[PDB]
Amino acid sequence: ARVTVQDAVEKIGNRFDLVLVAARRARQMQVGGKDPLVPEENDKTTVIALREIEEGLINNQILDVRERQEQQE
């Protein structure tokens, strides 16, 4: 579980962009496929995405390059 997002909002510029990117990542996680990169501990889709933000491995740039590579079929 997670209680605060101070470190995550430190990793990204401001809180609003963090909310937007976390929402997009959670939507990808939940609607279909996209196995999360960090092991789960029986948590909801929203928080598990947010953790990936504070690991420094998901952001606006990293998330965008992946999807265009998926859509090029």
Partner: protein
């Protein structure tokens, strides 16, 4: 989906296009059957079907007949929702005038046709004739006639002139009036006429004419021809129990108007005599008037309830109208209510929730999860198993609510902390459990206050709540940097009782290995909770490069402090937990953690503090008893002495040697002194006690009495209440304000006889009444602040301007009210901070200030700094990111897209509840003496007399900072020279307060020149004084031949020459005013500026009046232009004054009453914006003369003065934002190359943006002047007519927008809230950037 909203007048053509039929039957339904009446107000043919996909005839049914008209009923087969859209029209038999356009505050028809409003109503109501075309007669085209005049003119002229009646005549004359010809005639007229009264009216008329010219509307459309009908479903005939039906006011008025139309159209067919048709048409006009607006013209239509019926205008305006009740705020689903109850075992980021509420709220979520696990297949089956409360239901509910945050609010939601997110945890019972620490933020106590819960649905909402509105992310208030998680009450008492040594206790004087061992002793009962010992402790410091270093030693502390030391994290030093640890200390300690350890450690530490405090307060068992109220022993006898005192003073009144006021003040002072003595004695007796030490001697320690512990720690109460318990209650007041001479000598511990209790209730009733009636006024004020400031969002990083305002510590002449530190903290420097050493850069330009830069200023002792401010930022439709400064919530620079206007409005409006409606100079501290804005002379006695109005005192410290500032009248006495190292507690200035002097200019000899005796001056040797002196006669005896004779006391030397002052040599005669007595005589020596004559002479409403920029009842007039004072042709009822510039012309004139005080004479040089009379200073003049940067400093100072008087801390950043929203409009001065009229009033930002490219090209700019508007009026005058319409005066704003054909852009916050789209703020700001990029 839609770019913008367009509003304009209607046309009979578009009204006919809207409608699908015409209505002719006033009846609605059969009332026998439940079927709609054909051709009535619910006609199935006109509007639509009743049952979905079922025509009235019933011949065609189901989807197969969709889009097909039935043969006999003729009702298309489609869904029933169309009943909400299709409209009807009624063909009026005669034209009818629209009420709104006729009866606004300015009448549209009145100014368009250029007639007084009274005549138009007479014409419409058929009580007076009117000409429609004069022709070749002796009658004007727009002349008003009556019966007798026209009947005489009927046979005098006949068909030569044309005159008619009613709305038909009004429409005929309106259509006959040309528009461009009128516009060009006005254009010719304005440049010719020279009269201010004509200017404004003519400008308004020409502006309205141009508005009709540019807009695609025509004036004749203003008179209704076909009346639209509201769709049926919006005015429903809902059935109740029984055959009766519920009818709305709309149906009744529509039925009345349609029935009257039918009657008049039937009566007109038979050509009834004109007497009949006049009354019928007039009263039909009354019916339509009542339909569109009830009660505007006169007596209102009333029903069986005897109260006025609702109308269309009544259903839009007001709190019960459409806007404020169903668009800005609307009831929601997924919500619940409950009663609050404290829970100590919860962590900071979570709250309780009853099982039933959780189940009811998350029922939609449970259905899905049951389907996923396969426990039930159909939704009906899942609903069946939910209501049974099966064992699986609770398990699945627990699984689905692990991290689903919920919202908590408590009405009223004063500040933005009123709504907070939480993570629910399931509990039993039927009450909502809440964490104690946050109870201070809600201002919620556990005396029956109720909470409401709402539940977010989408992932965006959940993440938004978790990252923004969670409790752990709200620890610094937006109003000011002070923390908002301060522990209070029970916890504070526990911590205080923990850390307090006793001179002797069990197990005192031993040595302990560590805190872990110390806890073992206390639990075993082998040592007292507080007894001084020596313990080994280990503390860590982050003094290295972000790394912790360990150190170990022995400290002399108590057992309890060692127990408390476990929960403190690594970074903090040990000295922070070694004092008594009251309320004020503990919060400070907590705050230090947030300064060093970030956020997670500080929230964990706060939670641990609350746990430990509750536990050790419970184990303490601190209780209050009757014996705890220690009544001082001396108290009794002291009262006797006081009695003896008054026993003498009353005798003085019996002897007549003292008056009523003298005795009153004497007894008041004596009783106050007795009260102070009793209070001091009581505190001194209570606060200390004796207990035997280790060697058997008495030793005084701080007392362990329960009341003293609960008072000193600050947990609850203050010294005033402890006074109220033991010592006397004190002086009490009458309702009006007078103080009762006899005080209440008794305290609450002992009895109060009857009358003492009675007189004690005078104050309490006043307090309750003020508290009850302050919440109505204050909250409303907050609303007015929000609508003014709801358009402010940060949009750009840097504006790129150097303009700013200087910031100085505010001083009244005593101690600094606010030092330089806090006012400038968290802003940006407009210019580089320069060292007192010349040409040294202490602070680079465009650098944020924080703790690391502020302390640099303190060490360097800088005087003042000019910082960038929001009121001067240049970006249009927004605020520069740097200009706003540092965001107070997070502590770093503000980020784009945050709503600052609403935050400032909430911050300033929240503390309003804590407000209530109802001769010599002495230095105090050591320092130098320094004078600026001063010019004076050295008198004969050797001292200095001042002749400069702007003289201000300073007390320079050891380094150069200013400590105090005073205002002194001219012609005072300066015992010391400037620049001398003066000592404190020594008077410096002296003057006469009750008289104003006529002091001379320089050293010279007075010669009796140009005084006329007997009409201007007389030798009034009054017998009460026996002194002969020259006394100027009054203004009554003197007349035009005597008032024009001004006594000119010319100051001359021995040779009789004029004043040889440096630079100029004007003859310095002094025109003496009336009632002036000249004690000095001719030939008497005059010092340097010696006297010649001595002439004789708050709360929330204040804040509200200050913000509205109300003109004060006694406006202190100012100067207008720089130049020398020059009198004029006076005594023309008022006075005349002229200012003569050095080179410029001097045509300015203004009226001044004689009876008001005058402070400036001929022999003074006045700068623009200098006071002439006395009193309050109106904001409009301050803006007009001294500029923008003066008015913004005045308002901020006054508001902050009120707040600091009431002890409320609010940052000055929020105050000035509203000021920026008051200076929105501006008035053109000269058009130049622009395309604006001189008399127009347009937006300052609009002028700046339009003019900016004009100056960029080969053109010249347009001169303008910024104007100030009250918040109430400034809110009304905005471009976005939706927001203005929603706020106040709905009728005026809609009509003004419709007449001008204005168009909305939908760029604000409120107007975006109305139509359901994302607001351009916060998270939604990124979306609008994407949207704006596409267009």
């Amino acid at each position: 989906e839609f770019d913008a909203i367009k509003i304009a007048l209607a046309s009979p053509d578009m009204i006919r296009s809207w409608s699908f039929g015409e209505v002719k039957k006033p009846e609605t339904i059969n009332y026998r059957t439940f079927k709609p009446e054909r051709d009535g107000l619910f006609c199935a043919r006109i509007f639509g079907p009743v049952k979905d996909y079922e025509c009235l005839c019933g011949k065609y049914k189901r989807l197969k007949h969709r889009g097909v008209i039935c043969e006999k009923c003729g009702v298309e087969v489609t869904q029933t929702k169309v009943r909400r859209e299709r409209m009807g029209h009624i063909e009026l038999a005669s034209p009818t005038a629209h009420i709104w356009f006729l009866k606004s505050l300015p009448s549209r028809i009145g100014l368009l046709l250029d007639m007084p409003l009274r005549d138009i109503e007479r014409v419409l109501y058929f009580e007076s004739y009117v000409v429609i075309e004069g022709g070749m007669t002796n009658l004007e085209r727009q002349q008003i006639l009556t019966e007798e005049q026209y009947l005489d003119a009927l046979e005098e002229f006949g068909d030569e002139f044309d005159a008619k009646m009613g709305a038909e005549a009004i429409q005929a004359l309106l259509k006959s009036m040309d528009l461009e010809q009128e516009c060009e005639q006005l254009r010719e007229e304005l440049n010719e006429t020279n009269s201010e009264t004509k200017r404004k009216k003519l400008t308004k008329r020409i502006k309205l004419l141009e508005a009709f010219v540019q807009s695609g509307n025509k004036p004749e459309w203003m008179i209704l021809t076909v009346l639209p009908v509201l769709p049926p479903d919006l005015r429903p005939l809902v059935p109740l129990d029984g055959g009766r039906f519920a009818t709305s006011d709309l149906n009744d008025l529509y039925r009345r108007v349609i029935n009257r139309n039918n009657r008049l159209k039937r009566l007109l067919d038979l050509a009834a005599p004109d007497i009949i048709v006049r009354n019928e048409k007039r009263m039909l006009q009354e019916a339509v008037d009542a339909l569109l607006d009830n009660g505007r013209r006169g007596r209102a239509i009333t029903g069986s309830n005897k109260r006025p019926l609702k109308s269309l205008a009544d259903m839009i305006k007001g709190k019960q109208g459409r806007f404020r009740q169903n668009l800005l705020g609307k009831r929601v689903d997924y919500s619940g209510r409950s009663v609050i109850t404290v829970g100590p075992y919860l962590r900071l980021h979570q709250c309780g929730l009853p099982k039933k509420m959780a189940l009811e709220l998350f029922k939609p979520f449970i259905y899905g999860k049951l389907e996923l696990r396969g426990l039930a297949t159909t939704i009906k089956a899942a609903k069946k198993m939910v209501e049974r409360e099966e064992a699986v239901v609770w398990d699945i509910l627990d699984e689905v609510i692990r991290e689903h945050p919920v919202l908590l609010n408590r009405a009223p939601t004063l500040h933005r902390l009123g709504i907070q997110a939480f993570e629910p945890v399931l509990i039993e019972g039927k009450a909502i459990q809440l964490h104690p620490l946050v109870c201070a933020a809600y201002n919620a106590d556990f005396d029956g206050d109720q909470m409401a819960v709402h539940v977010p649905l989408t992932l965006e909402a959940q993440l938004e709540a978790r990252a923004l509105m969670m409790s752990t992310n709200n620890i610094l208030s937006p109003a000011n940097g002070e923390p908002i998680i301060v522990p209070s009450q029970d916890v504070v008492l526990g911590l205080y009782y923990m850390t307090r040594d006793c001179v002797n206790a069990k197990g005192e004087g031993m040595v302990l290995t560590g805190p872990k061992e110390a806890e073992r002793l206390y639990r075993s009962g082998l040592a007292s909770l507080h007894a001084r010992v020596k313990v080994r402790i280990t503390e860590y410091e982050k003094d290295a490069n972000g790394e912790l270093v360990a150190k170990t030693s022995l400290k002399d502390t108590t057992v309890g402090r060692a127990i408390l030391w476990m929960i403190v994290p690594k970074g903090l030093p040990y000295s922070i937990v070694n004092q008594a640890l009251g309320k004020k200390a503990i919060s400070k300690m907590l705050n230090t953690c947030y300064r060093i350890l970030g956020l997670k450690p500080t929230v964990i530490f706060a939670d641990q503090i609350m746990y430990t405090g509750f536990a050790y307060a419970a184990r303490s068992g601190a209780s209050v008893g009757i014996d705890d109220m220690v009544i001082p022993e001396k108290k009794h006898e002291i009262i006797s002495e006081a009695e003896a005192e008054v026993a003498e003073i009353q005798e003085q009144f019996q002897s007549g040697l003292v008056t009523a006021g003298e005795r009153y003040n004497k007894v008041i002072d004596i009783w106050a002194a007795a009260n102070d003595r009793v209070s001091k004695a009581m505190m001194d007796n209570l606060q200390t006690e004796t207990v035997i030490n280790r060697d058997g001697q008495e030793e005084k320690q701080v007392s362990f009495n329960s009341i003293y512990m609960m008072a000193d720690s600050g947990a609850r109460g203050s010294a005033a209440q402890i006074r109220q318990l033991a010592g006397m209650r004190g002086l009490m007041a009458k309702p009006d304000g007078s103080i009762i001479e006899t005080p209440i000598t008794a305290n609450f511990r002992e009895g109060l006889n009857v009358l003492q209790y009675f007189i004690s209730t005078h104050g309490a009733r006043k307090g309750l009444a003020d508290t009850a009636l302050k919440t109505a006024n204050s909250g409303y004020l907050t609303r007015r602040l929000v609508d003014v400031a709801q358009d402010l969002v940060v949009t750009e990083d840097d504006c790129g301007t150097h303009e700013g305002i200087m910031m100085t510590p505010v001083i009244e002449g005593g101690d600094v009210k606010e030092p330089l530190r806090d006012r400038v903290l968290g802003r940006v420097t407009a210019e580089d901070v320069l060292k007192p050493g010349t040409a040294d850069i202490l602070v680079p330009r465009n650098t944020l200030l924080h703790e690391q830069w502020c302390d640099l200023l303190e060490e360097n002792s800088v005087d003042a700094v000019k910082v960038r401010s929001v009121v001067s930022c240049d970006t249009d439709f927004g605020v520069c990111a740097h200009c706003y400064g540092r965001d107070l919530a997070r502590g770093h620079i503000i980020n784009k897209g945050e709503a600052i206007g609403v935050i400032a409005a909430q911050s300033i409006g929240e503390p309003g509840t804590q407000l209530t409606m109802r001769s010599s100079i002495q230095v105090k501290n050591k320092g130098s003496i320094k004078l600026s804005n001063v010019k004076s002379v050295v008198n004969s006695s050797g001292k200095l007399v001042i002749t400069s109005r702007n003289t201000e005192l300073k007390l320079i410290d050891e380094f150069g900072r200013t400590k105090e500032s005073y205002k002194v009248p001219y012609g005072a006495v300066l015992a010391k020279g400037d620049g001398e190292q003066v000592a404190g507690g020594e008077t410096v200035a002296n003057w006469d307060p009750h008289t104003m002097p006529v002091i001379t200019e320089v050293s010279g000899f007075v010669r009796f020149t140009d005084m006329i005796d007997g009409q201007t001056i007389t030798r009034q040797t009054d017998e009460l004084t026996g002194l002969s002196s020259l006394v100027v006669l009054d203004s009554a005896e003197r007349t035009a031949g005597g008032k024009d004779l001004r006594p000119a006391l010319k100051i001359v030397d021995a040779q009789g020459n004029d004043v040889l002052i440096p630079g100029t040599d004007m003859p310095a005669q002094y025109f003496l005013p009336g009632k002036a007595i000249v004690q000095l005589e001719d030939g008497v020596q005059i010092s340097s500026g010696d006297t010649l004559a001595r002439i004789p002479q708050g709360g929330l409403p204040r804040v509200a009046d200050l913000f509205e920029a109300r003109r004060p009842k006694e406006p202190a007039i100012l100067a207008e232009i720089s130049g020398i004072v020059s009198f004029g042709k006076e005594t023309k009822g008022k006075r005349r004054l002229v200012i003569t510039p050095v080179d410029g012309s001097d045509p300015y004139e203004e009226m001044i009453p004689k009876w008001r005080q005058l402070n400036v004479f001929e022999g003074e040089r006045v700068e623009r914006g200098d006071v002439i009379s006395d009193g309050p200073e109106a904001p409009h003049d301050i803006l007009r003369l001294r500029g923008v940067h003066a008015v913004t400093r005045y308002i901020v100072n006054e508001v902050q003065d009120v707040y600091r008087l009431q002890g409320v801390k609010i940052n000055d950043k929020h105050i000035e934002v509203i000021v920026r929203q008051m200076l929105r409009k501006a008035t053109i001065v000269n058009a130049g190359s622009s395309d604006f009229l001189e008399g127009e009033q347009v937006e300052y930002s609009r002028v700046k943006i339009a003019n900016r490219e004009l100056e960029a090209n080969g053109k010249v700019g347009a001169t303008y002047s910024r104007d100030l508007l009250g918040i109430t009026k400034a809110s009304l005058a905005t471009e976005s007519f939706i927001s203005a319409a929603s706020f106040q005066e709905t009728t005026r704003v809609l009509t003004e927008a419709a007449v001008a054909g204005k168009r909305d852009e939908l760029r604000g916050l409120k107007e975006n809230v109305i139509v359901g789209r994302l607001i351009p703020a916060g998270t939604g700001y990124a979306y609008h950037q994407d949207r704006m990029r596409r267009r």
